[PDB]
Symmetry: C3
Subunit: 46 residues, 3 copies
């Protein structure tokens, strides 16, 4: 059915949008974790 | 082809639920990191 | 509607596969944060 297929496609797109947003969030987080790991290292913790 | 349509819609719900949990875990992580940054600043560590 | 339904299902699988990679990324971040909290603790910060 044409109408339901169309709606499904729209939902898929919105989900791909949320996945984009999520991947960015994870990348920023991993950058922050590296930054922290490195400063923890430089301040001589262990 | 209604049953295959329903099958797909079910998968979409299942995915959205997964996205939800994921977003929440991210929330918690971001707050933990904010906390760690705070205590880092407070103890006057160099770098950043 | 057949080729369209099949492509939709293809996209569903690619999304499911991405979500799996994202969960693994989150698990790794959570372990690194656990480790960071350990080191901060051992060093008597704050």
């Amino acid at each position: 059915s044409e109408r339901q297929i169309l709606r499904i496609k729209q939902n898929i797109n919105q989900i791909a949008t949320k996945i984009q947003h999520i991947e960015f969030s994870i990348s920023e987080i991993e950058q922050e974790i590296e930054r922290i790991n490195k400063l923890i290292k430089q301040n001589g913790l262990l």
